[PDB]
Amino acid sequence: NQKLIANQFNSAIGKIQDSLSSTPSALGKLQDVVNHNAQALNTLVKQL
């Protein structure tokens, strides 16, 4: 069934572009690290 397995794989890699592209919480785990660090620094700068 090589031709279908190859097309299903080829399409799924195609959808992965869109699902990553639009949904907001897709890159949430990486973004939360960046935000958590910035708030921690900002409180320190404000506690001055």
Add this chain to the structure above:
Amino acid sequence: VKNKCVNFNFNGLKGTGVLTESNKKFLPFQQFGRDIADTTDAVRDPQT
């Protein structure tokens, strides 16, 4: 004196730093400037 780190007391605002020309327009009443984190990031020279 501009472009040289200097101790500066403006109209009672006191700081140490380098003074350069800038691309932001203050409103007429507004005298001194500030940035996120509440640092004094601009001054309008009192005489000129």
